[PDB]
Amino acid sequence: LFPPQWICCDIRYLDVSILGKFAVVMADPPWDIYGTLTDDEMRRLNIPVLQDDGFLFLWVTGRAMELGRECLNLWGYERVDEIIWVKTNQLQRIIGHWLNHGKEHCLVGVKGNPQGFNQGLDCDVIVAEVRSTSHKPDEIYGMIERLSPGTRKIELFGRPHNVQPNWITLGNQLDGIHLLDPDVVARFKQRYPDGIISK
Amino acid sequence: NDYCQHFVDTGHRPQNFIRDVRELIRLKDELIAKSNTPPMYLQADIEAFDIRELTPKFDVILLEPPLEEYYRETKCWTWDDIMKLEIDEIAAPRSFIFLWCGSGEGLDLGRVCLRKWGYRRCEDICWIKTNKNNPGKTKTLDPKAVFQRTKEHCLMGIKGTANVDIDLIITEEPEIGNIEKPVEIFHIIEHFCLGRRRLHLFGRDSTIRPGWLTVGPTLTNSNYNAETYASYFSAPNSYLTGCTEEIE
Numbered sequence: 001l002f003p004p005q006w007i008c009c010d011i012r013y014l015d016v017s018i019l020g021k022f023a024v025v026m027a028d029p030p031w032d033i034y035g036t037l038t039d040d041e042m043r044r045l046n047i048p049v050l051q052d053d054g055f056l057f058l059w060v061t062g063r064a065m066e067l068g069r070e071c072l073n074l075w076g077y078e079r080v081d082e083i084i085w086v087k088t089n090q091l092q093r094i095i096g097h098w099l100n101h102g103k104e105h106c107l108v109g110v111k112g113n114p115q116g117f118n119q120g121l122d123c124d125v126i127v128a129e130v131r132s133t134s135h136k137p138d139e140i141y142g143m144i145e146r147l148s149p150g151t152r153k154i155e156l157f158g159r160p161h162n163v164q165p166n167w168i169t170l171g172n173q174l175d176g177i178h179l180l181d182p183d184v185v186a187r188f189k190q191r192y193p194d195g196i197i198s199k
Numbered sequence: 200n201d202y203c204q205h206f207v208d209t210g211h212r213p214q215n216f217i218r219d220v221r222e223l224i225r226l227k228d229e230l231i232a233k234s235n236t237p238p239m240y241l242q243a244d245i246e247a248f249d250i251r252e253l254t255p256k257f258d259v260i261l262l263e264p265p266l267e268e269y270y271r272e273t274k275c276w277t278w279d280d281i282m283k284l285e286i287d288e289i290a291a292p293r294s295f296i297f298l299w300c301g302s303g304e305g306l307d308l309g310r311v312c313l314r315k316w317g318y319r320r321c322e323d324i325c326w327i328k329t330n331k332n333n334p335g336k337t338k339t340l341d342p343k344a345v346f347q348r349t350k351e352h353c354l355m356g357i358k359g360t361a362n363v364d365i366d367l368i369i370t371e372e373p374e375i376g377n378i379e380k381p382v383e384i385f386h387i388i389e390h391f392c393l394g395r396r397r398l399h400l401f402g403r404d405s406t407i408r409p410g411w412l413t414v415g416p417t418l419t420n421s422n423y424n425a426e427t428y429a430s431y432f433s434a435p436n437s438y439l440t441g442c443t444e445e446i447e
């Protein structure tokens with residue numbers, strides 16, 4: 001079901017096996033470097049059930065550049081690309097104890113053998129204006145849609161402004177549960193007949 | 200404006216549209232120039248060369264092994280070779296490393312290297328290549344690539360116990376078969392004021408620079424002498440950053 005869908009939840013505790021398989025996963029984790037996750041919590045996330053063949057996009061900063069690579073490999077991905085977002089103001093000028101930081105990093109991992117994706121349409125540098133704090137650039141959704149148009153996607157640690165068509169967004173600041181895909185709805189009521197997500 | 204869509208539409212990379220790509224404090228550049236040692240350099244086949252011959256121990260090491268991926272349409276070093284370099288044997292206990300890693304598997308294996316030699320990565324410096332002069336030149340992709348690769352990374356590592364510069368270098372993509380890295384990496388390194396024993400491994404005649412010892416297989420001449428070189432840093436000059444006045 002194409003329109004935006006989302007689940008307010010604690011990603012540590014949701015049973016993600018009910019969501020099915022996805023062509024693309026994106027995560028912008030609250031790395032322990034607010035409502036963050038310990039390194040072990042990140043390692044333990046049940047990312048492997050989310051995909052059979054496809055790509056994962058993992059935002060990283062500071063020492064999560066290394067920890068994110070560890071998680072990526074633990075969950076079964078090879079890192080095959082690394083997008084950087086050059087942060088600009090509205091006039092296209094560029095906005096870490098040794099250098100000032102002009103960019104953010106997004107690791108790109110692959111799992112299995114994805115078929116029918118449009119690899120090489122976009123390049124690996126985003127130039128885009130900073131919006132609010134911790135707000136990733138919307139250009140990433142367009143890059144992912146051109147790479148894999150029409151397919152099902154899932155975002156971890158999203159916020160309300162992140163909900164997108166063809167995406168299911170998970171985060172604990174989303175407004176309730178909004179599911180439209182009948183397969184997901186069916187598995188969700190079976191797994192959560194009272195609409196509560198606990199252990 | 201979505202510059203990603205625009206790249207799909209026109210082939211102009213998004214970095215083509217970064218601009219400038221009220222204070223000055225370049226008494227430091229002049230101080231670096233005054234403190235710099237004479238350029239020193241040695242032709243040496245690094246695979247066959249006992250790295251321990253290079254003394255004393257270095258404060259900064261810039262490592263630029265010639266990766267195969269640099270020769271798209273063109274002796275390369277693999278990460279197997281690079282990882283087996285004894286770099287910890289020549290690095291000072293407090294010292295820095297700058298490792299050009301390319302844009303592929305080197306972003307991972309270069310991190311393995313840093314840890315193997317005892318460094319922690321403290322910065323990730325991206326050389327972003329514009330194509331203002333050649334919007335219509337598609338990239339022949341790595342088989343594993345998801346995206347067109349338009350940048351290279353130089354990883355900075357520290358071992359032992361911001362300022363003016365940004366972790367980005369923006370230049371036009373060099374002509375085919377030109378393997379040179381932007382000289383701006385030297386300015387960033389020298390602006391840190393890290394000490395005066397500076398080694399560039401896999402440098403070339405074209406990269407020799409005051410303040411640096413350059414060691415590489417393609418150098419045409421050498422002037423390296425270990426005792427002469429050590430004498431640049433003997434007392435009272437042992438601890439200088441390279442950013443302070445010479446001692447009377």
Ligand SMILES: CC1(C)CCN(Cc2ccc(NCC3(O)CCN(c4cc(NCc5ccccc5)ncn4)CC3)cn2)CC1
Nearest residue numbers: 009010011012028029030035036134135136157158171172
């Ligand atoms: C591209 C960048 C510039 C973007 C920013 N990134 C870093 C970054 C990422 C994310 C955020 N914020 C977003 C969230 O708020 C979303 C919902 N969210 C949780 C958390 C949870 N479990 C743990 C838990 C739950 C309750 C209590 C304690 C722990 N489960 C479900 N959603 C916590 C994160 C802020 N900055 C840098 C690159």
